[PDB]
Ligand binder design. Structure first.
Ligand SMILES: Nc1ncnc2c1ncn2[C@@H]1O[C@H](COP(=O)(O)OP(=O)(O)OP(O)(O)=S)[C@@H](O)[C@H]1O
Ligand SMILES: Nc1ncnc2c1ncn2[C@@H]1O[C@H](COP(=O)(O)OP(=O)(O)OP(O)(O)=S)[C@@H](O)[C@H]1O
Lengths: 635, 334, 246, 334, 246
C-alpha cells in the first residue's frame, strides 16, 4: 500500500497514550513565549533603575532554554520507549533502519508541530498577568496592554526547531541500538565510600556552623573556608547518592535474618538497587534547588532593606552640596511654604586612632593610625545624647562593614593627635548621621564632641585633605504633608541632578531588587516544577520495567492491596529522601546569608519549604496512581 | 449518606474554589479593578452556592436511596421514573438482562420436558415388540438352546421393566397410588415370570409369611417386591430364601431372609449408597443402582425403610419395612 | 480421598465472530497421594486446563470440588486467598525474583503466618538439605545454573505444606542430566511425605516416573494407564505403545 | 452520549455561567470596576471551566457506557470495576438480581446432560445382551418360526440402532468426516443385513450401478440407506428391487425401482414431513416414524441431496447426491 | 547444491563466572529442495541452532556458508540485505498487525520494491488461492479463526519468493485439523517452487511429513533418516520408535 496511509493510521490509533508528552510541550512553549514577549514589549522601559531593564532577560532566556530542553529530552522517553516490538517486527519483515526512523519521525514531527502551534496561542492569553505582576513588584502603574510582538514568535520557533533537531539524534540512537529481539553483592569498598560521603557532609555542615558563629574574623580566613565548604558539600552529597544509601540500607537488610514479606522486599530492594543507578541527576537537582532558594532569600532581604539604607545615605530629608544652588533653593522654597530647618552644621576632618581598638589581631592597622579623615561635630547641633568628659560613642551599625571591620568592645579610644591623647569610654549608643555618604567614602561612624574640642581641632589645622564644603547644607521637613510636590519641584530645580534626595534614591534599589526577585522566582519555580516531574517520569519507566514480578506474585494469590501497600511505602521513601536532603541543604545555605547582612527574617522560608513539600507530594501521589494502574492490568 | 455524595461531587467544588481564587487574585493584582466589592460579592456568591448544593444533594441522593431499596425488596416500582439518560440506561439494562435470563431458563426446562415425553413414547412403542417376542417364543420344543434363549429374554425383559419404572420415577410424584393387594397372587406372579429363572438356575425359596398383607400401588407394589426378589436372586443362589413377615416395631417388616451369602458386616453401611451396584457379582453392576435408591426415595412417601438384619453365611434379612397399615394412610395422602 | 472432583468442565475463548471452545466435557477424579500426568500435544487444552482447575481462569460451565469446597462460588478475593494458602505452583520458566537471595526467595511464602525466626530457619535448612542446594544460601539468582534455579523453585513450592502442587512441564528448559536429577528429587519428595502432583507435559520420558497417565486430545480425554507394579522401563514402553496408537 | 452528559450536568454549567454573567453585568454599570478590564477575567475563568469539563466528561463517561454496551448482546462480565460511590451501587444490584437466574439455569442444564449420559449408558447396556441373544440364535434350524423370530429380532435391533444413532444426533456436531468411499462393500454387507425380510415377503434385489463414488460420512450414510431402503421395502411388496445409480448430470440417481404398490400421488408431498409414518399399515406404530424426521434434520450438515419421484402402482424413486472433487473446500470456506 | 552448509559451529552462553555451552560440534549439510526437519526434546538447543543458522545470533566458533557466500565475516547492512533477499521466516507465534486488513498485511513486504500494483495483486491472488484464504481479503485480523491467522502469517513468508525458508514449531497454537491442513499445504508448496523449508519441531507426526529427519540430543546430532518410498505411516512408526530408543 502507501506508507503515508500506514503512518496516518498509526498516529490515529496511537494518539491515546501521548497526553503527558503534549501537556509538557504545551507548558514549556507557553512559559517561554510569555517570558520572551515580556522582554520584547516596549512598555517594560517604564521602570527606572541603573540596569537597562531588558538586559537581564537575555541572560534569563539563556538559562531557561537549557532547562526546557532538558525537560523535553527527559519527556521524549514516553513516546520512544513503547516502540520496541514494532521495530523488531519491521526489521523481521525486512525494512531497514532508515525507513523505520523516517516512519517514526513523521509522527514525531506531526505531534511536535501540533503542540507547538497550540502552545503559542495559550501563551499570548496569559501574557498579561505576568506583566501585571512585574508592574506590581516594582510599583510603576501606568496601564497594561496586550500585544503580539512577532519577534517573540520568531525566537520561540527558532529555539524549539533547534530543540527538535536535537531530539532527532536521540531517536536515531535508540532505533540504532535495537535488534530482532524476541517480538550483585557488596564489596568492602562501598562501606568506605558511604562512610566517607557521610563524614564529609557532616564536617561541611559543622565547619559552616563555625563560620557564621563568630570565628574566621579576618579577610584571609574566609575565602578558604568558602571554597572548602562548597567543594566538601558537593562531593559529600555526590558520595551520599552513590554508595551511602546502599550502606545504610544493608544494615537493616541484614538485621533481619533473611526473612521478609512483600512490603519490605518491594521497598528495600527497589531503593537499595535503584537509588545507586542514577546519582549525578539527584545531586544536580538538590544543589540547584538549595542555591535558588538561598538566592531568592538574599534578594528579598536586600529588597526589603531599602528604606533604612536610603535614610542612611540621605542624612537629612533632602540633601544639597552647591552653596549657590542651596541659596537658589532657599529663594524658591518661599513659594513652597514648608517649614525648613536647614542648618549649616560645621564639620572638620579631625584625626583619631582606632588601631588600639582592635579586638582581633595586631596586624590589622588600616592605613593611617592617627592621621585619619574622621569627622567631628560640636554639641550645639545634636543634643539627644549626653556624654561626659573623656567619653565617646560610635554612631553606625554598617552590616556590610561589620562583616569585616569590627571594633573592640572595651577598646579605649586613644586619640592619637599630633601631641595630645583623649581617652574615651563607651556608655551610650546612637545612630544619627550628620553627614552624607559622599563625604564619608567607605562609611565613618559619626563622632560627637564638645564645642571646645571642635575648636581646638579646627585651629590645629592639620595639613590633611578637607571636604570641599564644611558646613553641610542639609534641610529637614515638617510632618509628611507635601511630599510628592516637593519631590517634583526638587527634580525640576536640579536639572543636572548633581544633588541628593531621599524619596528619589529610595526607589532605584527597590526597582533593581524587584527585577532580581522576579527573575529569580520565575526561574526557580520553572526549574522546581521540571525537577519534580522528571522523577515522576523515571518512576513511570521503572514501573514499566517491573511487570513480570506482578504477573507472578499474583498467580500465587497476593491480591492487589498488599502490592499497592508496598508501592505506597516505596514511593514514600523514594520521594522523601531527596526532599529532606534538599531541605537541610537549603536551611544551611539560607542561614549563611543573613549573617553577612543584618537581622534575621524567617518570613519567606516557611512558604518556600511548604510549596517545596506540596509539589513533591503531588508528584508522589500521581506516581502511586500510575503504579496502581499498571499492577491492576497485570493478571 | 452525605459523605458519599460529597466524595463523588468533589471536582466541581474544587473548580468553584479555584475560579474564586483566580478571580480574587486577578482583582488583587489589577489596580483598575477594586477589591472590597469583589470580596463582598464573592462571599454572597458562596452563600448562594450552598443552597444549590443542598438542593442537588436532596434530589440525587433521594434517587440513589430508591435504587438501594430496590436492591433489596420485592417491588419493581421502587425505582423512580427515569428523567436523566443514565438512570434510564441502568433500569433498561436491568430489565433486559432479567428478561433474557428468564427466557433461557424457561427454554431449558421445556426442552427437558419434551425430551422426557419423547422417551416415554419410544419406551412404550418398543416395549410392545418384546411382548410380541414372548408370544412368538413360547412355542418351541428344543431344550438347551431354548432354555438359554429364555435366559437371555428374561434378562432383557427384566432390564426393560426395571428401567422403564426408572423412567416413570420422574413423575411418580404425580403418579402415586395406594390400594390393598394380597401377597399370594402377586408372589405367584413373580414366580411365574421368573419361572424360566426358577427352572433354569433352580434357586430355592420359602414363604413363611406370618403376616400376609402389604400395601402400595398394585404395579408399584409388584415392582418393589420383585425388586427385593431379584436383588436376592442376584445375591443368593440355591438357598432356602425364607420370605417371612413378622411385624417388628411400628412398620410391618417383611423379614425376607435369604439363606445365601448375605451381606458382609463390613459392607452393611455401604449398601445404601446412590447407584448401588454389588461389585462382588459383575451381574449387579449392570443394574442401574437406582433400585435401592429409588425404592428409598419414592419410599420416603411410601414410608418403606429398607432395614437390613444381615447375618453373613445364613443370608441377609431383606427387611423391606412396609409401614403399618395405619401409616400407609400417609402414603394415600401424598 | 477424591481431593479434585470435576463434572463436565467447559471453557471457551473469544466472543461473537471468533468464539472457540477448548474444553468440551472433561471429568477428573484425583485421589490422595497420587502422581498424575496429563499427556497431551502442542495444540491441546493443557495450559487452559491447568489455569481452570487452579482457579486462575474461569470455566464457562461446570463445577469443581477441591477438598470438598465449591470453587466456582467465591468471586475473586476468597479465590485468591484460598489459592495462596492451599496450592503450590511450579512453572516452566522464570519463577525467582531477580533481587532476592535464595533463602529469602524460598522463605517468602512462610512470612504470612509469621512463624518467628528459629523454626523458619530450621524448616528452611531441613528442606534445602533434601534438594542439595543448601550450600547456595547467599548467592543471587543470576550466578547459578538453570537446574539449581529449578530446584530452588521446587523448594519454594514444597516449603509451605500445600495440598495440591500444580506443575507445568518443569523439565522443559534443562538438559537430560538435570532433568533426571530434578525428576528423581520430585519423586523422593513425594515418597517421603504425601505430596500430590498434577503436572502436564508432552514427553513420555518425563511422564514415565508417574503413577497414572491420562491422554487428552483436543479437549476430550481418552484412555488411561496405571503403573501398578512394573519397573520404569516397562511402564515407559507401555506409554510408548499407547502414544504410538494415536 | 455527549448530549446526555451535558443534560445531566446542566445545573452546574448554569451556575457557573450565571456567576460569570453577574460578573460582567455588575462590572458594566459601576465606574469603580472598569467593564473593559473584566472580559480578561471572564475569559480566563471560562477557559479553565471548559478544560475542566473536558477532563470530567472523559473520566465520568466510562461505566455507564460499559453498561449500555452490555445492554443486550452478551458478556455478563463486561461490567467494569466501580471506583465512584454511586457505581458500587448498580453493580451490587445487578449481581443480587441475577444470581438467582444464573444458578437456576446452571442447575437445570446440569440435570439435562446428566440425564443424557444416563440414557446413553442405558442403551449400550441394552445393546450387549441383544448381541448375546443374536450370537445364540445364529444356530437354530426351523423355517416359519425362524422367519418370525428372526424378523422380530431384526426389527428390535434396528430400533435400538436407530436410538443409538439418535443419541448420536444429540451430539453429531463433532463427528464430521469427508473421504472417498465405494458403494460395493457397503451394499454387500447391508444386503447381508436385510435377508430375512426379503425371504418372508418374497422381495428380490437387482444391482446395476454407474457411479460408485460417495463423498460423506460412513455411519450416517449406512443409516440413511437403511432409512430409504427400509421405507421402500415397507412400501414395496413382492417386488424385485432394481437398485440402480445413473450419473444424471452432477447427481447420481440411486433409483430404487420397485414394482410394488408404491405411494399414492395425492400423498407424495407429505412423505418427509414431521415424523411421517405410513398410516396405511397398522403395524407401522412399531416403527418409530421419527426416522424420517431425524433423517430430514440431520441430512443438511453432511451434504447429501435427496430426490424423490413417487407414483402409485409403479413404486417410489429415491436418490441421494454426492459432491464433486472440487467441492470439499467450501466446507471450510462456504 | 548444498544450499546450506555448516562446520563445527559452537556456541556458549553466560559470562565469566557463569558459563554454559549448549552447542558442541554441530555439522549439517542440508541439501537444496529438501523438506528437512530437526527433532529432539525441549531444552536441547534447537531454537539456538535456528538463530545461528539464520545469522540472527553470532557463533563463538564455526563457519556457515549459504549459496557460495560466507556468513561469519559480513557487516550489518549487507547481512540485513541478504536476509531480505535470500531468506523467509515463520515463527511459532503469529505476528500480524491489527491496524491492517489481511490483504495489505500480507502484501506489506512486497510494497516497498518499486513495483506495479497489479503484479503484487495477482501474486497475492495466486498465494491466497493456494492457501485458500482468498475470501477474507477485506476482513480485519480480529474477526477470523486462529488457523486462518496462522495461514495468513505463513503466506506472508511466501509472497516475496525467498530462496530458503526457515520456521519454528508452527503447530503449537493450532488444532489437529488445522495443523494437518497447514502441514499438507506446506508439503504441496515444497515441490511447486523449490524452497528448502527447514522446520524445527519436537512432534513425531509433525515431522512425519518431512523426508530428512535429523535428531539431536543435547547439542550433538545422533542419527539421520530418509523417506525412501514409505507411505507417511511406516515412516511415522520408524521415526517414533527411533525416538523411543533414546
Ligand atoms: N487469550 C488467549 N490466550 C491463550 N490462548 C488462547 C487465547 N485465546 C484463545 N487461545 C487458544 O488457546 C490455546 C492455548 O493453548 P492451551 O489450549 O491453553 O494449552 P497448550 O497449547 O498446551 O499451551 P502450551 O503453551 O502448549 S503449555 C490455543 O489453541 C489458542 O489459540
Ligand atoms: N539468552 C539465552 N537464550 C537462550 N537460551 C538461554 C539463554 N540463557 C540461558 N539459556 C538456556 O540455554 C538453553 C538453550 O536451549 P534452547 O536453545 O532454547 O533449546 P529449546 O529450549 O529446546 O528451544 P525452544 O525455546 O524450546 S523452541 C536452555 O536451557 C535455556 O534455558
Amino acid at each position: 500500500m502507501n506508507i503515508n496511509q500506514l503512518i496516518l493510521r498509526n498516529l490515529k490509533k496511537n494518539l491515546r497514550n501521548y497526553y503527558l508528552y503534549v501537556f509538557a510541550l504545551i507548558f514549556s512553549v507557553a512559559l517561554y513565549f510569555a517570558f520572551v514577549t515580556l522582554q520584547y514589549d516596549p512598555a517594560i522601559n517604564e521602570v527606572k533603575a541603573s540596569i537597562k531593564g531588558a538586559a537581564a532577560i537575555k541572560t534569563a532566556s539563556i538559562l531557561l532554554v537549557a532547562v526546557v530542553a532538558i525537560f523535553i529530552l527527559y519527556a521524549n522517553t514516553i513516546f520512544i520507549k513503547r516502540r520496541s516490538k514494532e521495530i523488531g517486527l519491521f526489521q523481521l519483515i525486512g525494512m531497514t533502519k532508515h525507513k523505520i526512523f523516517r516512519i517514526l519521525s513523521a509522527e514525531n514531527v506531526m505531534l511536535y508541530f501540533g503542540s507547538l502551534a497550540i502552545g503559542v496561542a495559550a501563551g499570548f492569553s496569559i501574557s498579561k498577568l505576568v506583566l501585571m505582576i512585574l508592574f506590581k513588584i516594582v510599583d510603576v502603574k501606568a496601564d497594561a496592554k496586550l500585544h503580539f510582538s512577532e519577534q517573540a514568535l520568531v525566537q520561540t520557533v527558532i529555539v524549539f526547531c533547534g530543540i527538535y533537531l536535537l531530539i532527532m539524534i536521540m531517536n536515531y540512537t535508540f532505533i540504532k541500538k535495537q535488534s530482532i529481539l524476541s517480538l550483585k553483592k557488596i564489596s568492602f569498598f562501598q562501606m568506605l565510600i558511604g562512610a566517607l560521603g557521610i563524614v564529609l557532609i557532616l564536617t561541611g555542615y559543622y565547619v559552616s556552623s563555625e563560620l557564621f558563629g563568630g570565628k574566621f574574623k579576618t579577610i584571609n580566613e574566609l575565602f578558604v573556608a568558602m571554597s572548602f565548604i562548597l567543594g566538601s558539600v558537593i562531593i559529600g552529597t555526590f558520595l551520599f547518592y552513590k554508595g551511602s544509601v546502599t550502606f545504610i540500607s544493608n544494615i537493616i537488610r541484614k538485621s533481619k535474618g533473611g526473612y521478609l514479606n512483600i512490603s519490605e522486599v518491594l521497598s528495600l530492594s527497589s531503593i537499595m538497587f535503584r537509588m545507586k543507578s542514577n546519582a549525578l541527576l539527584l545531586t544536580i537537582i538538590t544543589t540547584v534547588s538549595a542555591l535558588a532558594i538561598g538566592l531568592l532569600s538574599l534578594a528579598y532581604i536586600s529588597y526589603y532593606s531599602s528604606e533604612k539604607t536610603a535614610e542612611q545615605n540621605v542624612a537629612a530629608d533632602f540633601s544639597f552640596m552647591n552653596e549657590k544652588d542651596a541659596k537658589l533653593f532657599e529663594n524658591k522654597l518661599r513659594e513652597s511654604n514648608i517649614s525648613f530647618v536647614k542648618k549649616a552644621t560645621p564639620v572638620l576632618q579631625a584625626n583619631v586612632d582606632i588601631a588600639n581598638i582592635m579586638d582581633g589581631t595586631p596586624k590589622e592597622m588600616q592605613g593611617d593610625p592617627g592621621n585619619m579623615q574622621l569627622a567631628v561635630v560640636s554639641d550645639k547641633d545634636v543634643k539627644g545624647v549626653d556624654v561626659a568628659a573623656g567619653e565617646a560613642v560610635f554612631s553606625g551599625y554598617t552590616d556590610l562593614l561589620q562583616k569585616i571591620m569590627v571594633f573592640k568592645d572595651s577598646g579605649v579610644i586613644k586619640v592619637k593627635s599630633k601631641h595630645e591623647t583623649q581617652p574615651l569610654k563607651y556608655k551610650g549608643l546612637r545612630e544619627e548621621f550628620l553627614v552624607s555618604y559622599t563625604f564619608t567614602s567607605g562609611g565613618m561612624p559619626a563622632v560627637i564632641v564638645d564645642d571646645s574640642l571642635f575648636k581646638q581641632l579646627d585651629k590645629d589645622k592639620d595639613p590633611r585633605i578637607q571636604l570641599a564644603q564644611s558646613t553641610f547644607i542639609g534641610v529637614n521637613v515638617k510632618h509628611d504633608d507635601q511630599m510628592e510636590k516637593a519631590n517634583e519641584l526638587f527634580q525640576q530645580v536640579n536639572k543636572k541632578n548633581e544633588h541628593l534626595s531621599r524619596l528619589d534614591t529610595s526607589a532605584a534599589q527597590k526597582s533593581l531588587f524587584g527585577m532580581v526577585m522576579f527573575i529569580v522566582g520565575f526561574l526557580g519555580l520553572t526549574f522546581l516544577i521540571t525537577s519534580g516531574c522528571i522523577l515522576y517520569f523515571k518512576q513511570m519507566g521503572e514501573s514499566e520495567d517491573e511487570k513480570p514480578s506482578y504477573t507472578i506474585l499474583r498467580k500465587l494469590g497476593f491480591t492487589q492491596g498488599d502490592l499497592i501497600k508496598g508501592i505506597r511505602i516505596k514511593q514514600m521513601y523514594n520521594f522523601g529522601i531527596p526532599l529532606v536532603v534538599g531541605l537541610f541543604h537549603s536551611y544551611f545555605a539560607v542561614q549563611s546569608g543573613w549573617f553577612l547582612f543584618g537581622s534575621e527574617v524567617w518570613a519567606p522560608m516557611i512558604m518556600v519549604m511548604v510549596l517545596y513539600t506540596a509539589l513533591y507530594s503531588i508528584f508522589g501521589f500521581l506516581s502511586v496512581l500510575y503504579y496502581k494502574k499498571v499492577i491492576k492490568s497485570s493478571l | 449518606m452525605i459523605k458519599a455524595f460529597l466524595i463523588e461531587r468533589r471536582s466541581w467544588i474544587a473548580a468553584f474554589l479555584f475560579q474564586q481564587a483566580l478571580m480574587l487574585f486577578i482583582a488583587f493584582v489589577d489596580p483598575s479593578i477594586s477589591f472590597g466589592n469583589v470580596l463582598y460579592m464573592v462571599y454572597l456568591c458562596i452563600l448562594f452556592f450552598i443552597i444549590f448544593l443542598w438542593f442537588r444533594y436532596r434530589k440525587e441522593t433521594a434517587f440513589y436511596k430508591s435504587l438501594k431499596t430496590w436492591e433489596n425488596n420485592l417491588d419493581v416500582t421502587a425505582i423512580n421514573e427515569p428523567e436523566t439518560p443514565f438512570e434510564a440506561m441502568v433500569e433498561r439494562s436491568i430489565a433486559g438482562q432479567t428478561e433474557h435470563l428468564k427466557q433461557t431458563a424457561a427454554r431449558h426446562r421445556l426442552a427437558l420436558e419434551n425430551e422426557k415425553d419423547e422417551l416415554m413414547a419410544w419406551i412404550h412403542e418398543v416395549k410392545t415388540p418384546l411382548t410380541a417376542m414372548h408370544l412368538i417364543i413360547d412355542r418351541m420344543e428344543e431344550k438347551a438352546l431354548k432354555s438359554q434363549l429364555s435366559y437371555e429374554w428374561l434378562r432383557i425383559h427384566l432390564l426393560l421393566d426395571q428401567q422403564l419404572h426408572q423412567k416413570r420415577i420422574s413423575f411418580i410424584e404425580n403418579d402415586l397410588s395406594v390400594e390393598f393387594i394380597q401377597l399370594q397372587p402377586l408372589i405367584f406372579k413373580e414366580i411365574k415370570d421368573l419361572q424360566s429363572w426358577c427352572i433354569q438356575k433352580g434357586i430355592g425359596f420359602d414363604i413363611q409369611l406370618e403376616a400376609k398383607e402389604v400395601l402400595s400401588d398394585a404395579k408399584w407394589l409388584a415392582f418393589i417386591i420383585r425388586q427385593l426378589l431379584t436383588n436376592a436372586v442376584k445375591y443368593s443362589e440355591a438357598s432356602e430364601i425364607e420370605i417371612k413377615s413378622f411385624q417388628k416395631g411400628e412398620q410391618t417388616q417383611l423379614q425376607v431372609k435369604d439363606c445365601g451369602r448375605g451381606i458382609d458386616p463390613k459392607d452393611v453401611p455401604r449398601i445404601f449408597d446412590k447407584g448401588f451396584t454389588s461389585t462382588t457379582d459383575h451381574h449387579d453392576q449392570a443394574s442401574t443402582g437406582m433400585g435401592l435408591y429409588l425404592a428409598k426415595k419414592a419410599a420416603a412417601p411410601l414410608l418403606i425403610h429398607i432395614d437390613v438384619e444381615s447375618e453373613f453365611g445364613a443370608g441377609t434379612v431383606f427387611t423391606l419395612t412396609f409401614p403399618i397399615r395405619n401409616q400407609f394412610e400417609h402414603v394415600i395422602s401424598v | 480421598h477424591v481431593i479434585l472432583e470435576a463434572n463436565k468442565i467447559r471453557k471457551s475463548y473469544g466472543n461473537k465472530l471468533n468464539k472457540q471452545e477448548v474444553l468440551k466435557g472433561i471429568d477428573i477424579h484425583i485421589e490422595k497421594g497420587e502422581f498424575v500426568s496429563i499427556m497431551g500435544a502442542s495444540g491441546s487444552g493443557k495450559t487452559t486446563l491447568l489455569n481452570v482447575l487452579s482457579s486462575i481462569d474461569q470455566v464457562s460451565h461446570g463445577t469443581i470440588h477441591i477438598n470438598g469446597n465449591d470453587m466456582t462460588a467465591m468471586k475473586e478475593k476468597q479465590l485468591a486467598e484460598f489459592r495462596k494458602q492451599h496450592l503450590g505452583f511450579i512453572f516452566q520458566d522464570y519463577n525467582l525474583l531477580d533481587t532476592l537471595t535464595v533463602k529469602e526467595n524460598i522463605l517468602l511464602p512462610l512470612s504470612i503466618t509469621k512463624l518467628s525466626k528459629k523454626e523458619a530457619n530450621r524448616k528452611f535448612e531441613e528442606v534445602a538439605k533434601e534438594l542439595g542446594i543448601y550450600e547456595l544460601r547467599d548467592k543471587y539468582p543470576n550466578e547459578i545454573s538453570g537446574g539449581q534455579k529449578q530446584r530452588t523453585s521446587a523448594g519454594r513450592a514444597f516449603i509451605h505444606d500445600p495440598s495440591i502442587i500444580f506443575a507445568d512441564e518443569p523439565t522443559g528448559a534443562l538438559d537430560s542430566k538435570s532433568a533426571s536429577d530434578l525428576l528423581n528429587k520430585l519423586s523422593q519428595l513425594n515418597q517421603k511425605r504425601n505430596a500430590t502432583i498434577i503436572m502436564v507435559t508432552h514427553d513420555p520420558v518425563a511422564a514415565s516416573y508417574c503413577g497414572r497417565v491420562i491422554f487428552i486430545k483436543d479437549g476430550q480425554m481418552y484412555t488411561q494407564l496405571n503403573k501398578g507394579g512394573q519397573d520404569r522401563q516397562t511402564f515407559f514402553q507401555d506409554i510408548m505403545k499407547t502414544q504410538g496408537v494415536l
